[PDB]
A paper describes a structure:
Red fluorescent proteins with a large Stokes’ shift (LSSRFPs) are genetically encoded and have a large difference (approximately 100 nm) between the excitation and emission peaks. They efficiently absorb blue light and emit red fluorescence. Recently, based on the conventional bright mScarlet RFP, we developed the LSSRFP LSSmScarlet. In this study, using the previously reported LSSmScarlet LSSRFP as a template, we developed pH-, photo-, and chemically stable LSSRFPs, named LSSmScarlet2 and LSSmScarlet3.
To explain the high pH stability of the LSSmScarlet2 protein and to elucidate the effects of mutations introduced into LSSmScarlet during its directed molecular evolution, we determined the crystal structure of LSSmScarlet2 using X-ray diffraction at 1.41 Å resolution. We observed the LSSmScarlet2 protein as a monomer in the crystal at pH 6.0 according to estimation by the PISA server in a fluorescent state. LSSmScarlet2 has a canonical β-barrel overall structure with the DsRed-like chromophore, which consists of 69MYG71 amino acids and is located in the middle of the central α−helix inside the β-barrel. The MYG-chromophore in LSSmScarlet2 makes five direct hydrogen bonds (H-bonds) to residues R71, W94, R96, D147, and E216 and additional H-bonds through the water molecules to residues T112, E145, and L200. The phenolic hydroxyl group of the chromophore makes two H-bonds with the side chain of the D147 residue and with one internal water molecule. The negative charge of the pair D147/phenolic hydroxyl group of the chromophore is balanced by the positively charged R198 residue, which is close to the phenolic group of the chromophore and forms a solvent water-mediated H-bond with D147. Similar to LSSmScarlet, we attributed the large Stokes’ shift found in LSSmScarlet2 to ESPT from the phenolic hydroxyl group of the chromophore to the –COOH side chain group of the D147 residue. There were six mutations in LSSmScarlet2 compared to LSSmScarlet: I74T, D170G, D177H, Q189L, Y215F, and G226D. I74T substitution results in the formation of a hydrogen bond with the S218 residue. Hence, the I74T mutation was the only one responsible for the improved pH stability of the LSSmScarlet2 protein, and among all LSSRFPs tested, the LSSmScarlet2/G170D mutant and LSSmScarlet2 demonstrated the highest pH stability in the entire pH range.
Residue numbers in the entry: 4 to 66, 71 to 226
Write the structure that this text describes.
C-alpha cells in the first residue's frame, strides 16, 4: 500500500527504554504531524528514572522518519515501507568521548504509527555538559544520506548549544532499513531543525517540534 497508507495527517505513539552512564530510564509519548509538509510535534513524559540526570538534547533526535518533505523527484524511502514499516540503528559520538547507540522499530497499528526505541549512552564525563544539563537545544543540521544494499546510510554533523555560549559537537551515523524492498532514492540531504517548545522545570514533561526537508546535494 506504501505512500497511500501515510496520510496528510498522522499520529504516532513512542516508548523509549534507555540508560545514560548506567542510569536507567523510560519515556512514553505521543505525537502528530503533516508527513508531506515535513512538520511534526511530540509530547514526551518520563515514566521511569526521573528526573533525568542528563540533557534532554541526547533524547530529542530519537523520537520519526515518515515526516520528511521531499521534492517531486526524490522517492521517500520511509513512506514507501508501509504498512510493514522500518527500523533504524544509530551511533552518536561526542567531542568529549560520550557515545550513544540507539535502535528503533517503526510499525503501523490501526492507522497510528508505533515507535519503540532502545538507547545506551556511555563514557560521558560526569562533570561534562550532558550529565550537568548545560546544553540549550540542537542547532539546525543536515543529514547526508546515501543508498546501499536496499538501505539508507546517514551522517550528521550535530551541534548542541551550550548554556553561556558555544557549541558541543557530535557525529551521528545511522542505517535506516525498510522491512520490505522499496524504490531507492539517490544520495541526498535532509535539512532539520528540532526545537524544544515547552517543558516543566524538571523536564519530566517535554514538547518538541521538528521540520525535516529533503533536497539534492550540489556536489
Amino acid at each position: 500500500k506504501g505512500e497511500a497508507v501515510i496520510k496528510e495527517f498522522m499520529r504516532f505513539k513512542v516508548h523509549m527504554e534507555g540508560s545514560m552512564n548506567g542510569h536507567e530510564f523510560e519515556i512514553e509519548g505521543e505525537g502528530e504531524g503533516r508527513p508531506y509538509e515535513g512538520t511534526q510535534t511530540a509530547k514526551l513524559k518520563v515514566t521511569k528514572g526521573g528526573p533525568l540526570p542528563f540533557s534532554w538534547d541526547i533524547l530529542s533526535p530519537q523520537f520519526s522518519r515518515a515526516f520528511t518533505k521531499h521534492p517531486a523527484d526524490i522517492p521517500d524511502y520511509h513512506k514507501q515501507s508501509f504498512p510493514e514499516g522500518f527500523k533504524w540503528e544509530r551511533v552518536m559520538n561526542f567531542e568529549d568521548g560520550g557515545a550513544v547507540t540507539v535502535t528503533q522499530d517503526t510499525s503501523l497499528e490501526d492507522g497510528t504509527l508505533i515507535y519503540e526505541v532502545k538507547l545506551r549512552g556511555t563514557n560521558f564525563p560526569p562533570d561534562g555538559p550532558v550529565m550537568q544539563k548545560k546544553t540549550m537545544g540542537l542547532e539546525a543540521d543536515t543529514e547526508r544520506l546515501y543508498p546501499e544494499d536496499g538501505v539508507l546510510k546517514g551522517d550528521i554533523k550535530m551541534a548542541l548549544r551550550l548554556k553561556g555560549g558555544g557549541r558541543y559537537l557530535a557525529h551521528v551515523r545511522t542505517t535506516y532499513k525498510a522491512k520490505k524492498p522499496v524504490l531507492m532514492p539517490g544520495a541526498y540531504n535532509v535539512d532539520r531543525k528540532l526545537d524544544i517548545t515547552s517543558h516543566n522545570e524538571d523536564y519530566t514533561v517535554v514538547e518538541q517540534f521538528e521540520r525535516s526537508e529533503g533536497r539534492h546535494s550540489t556536489g
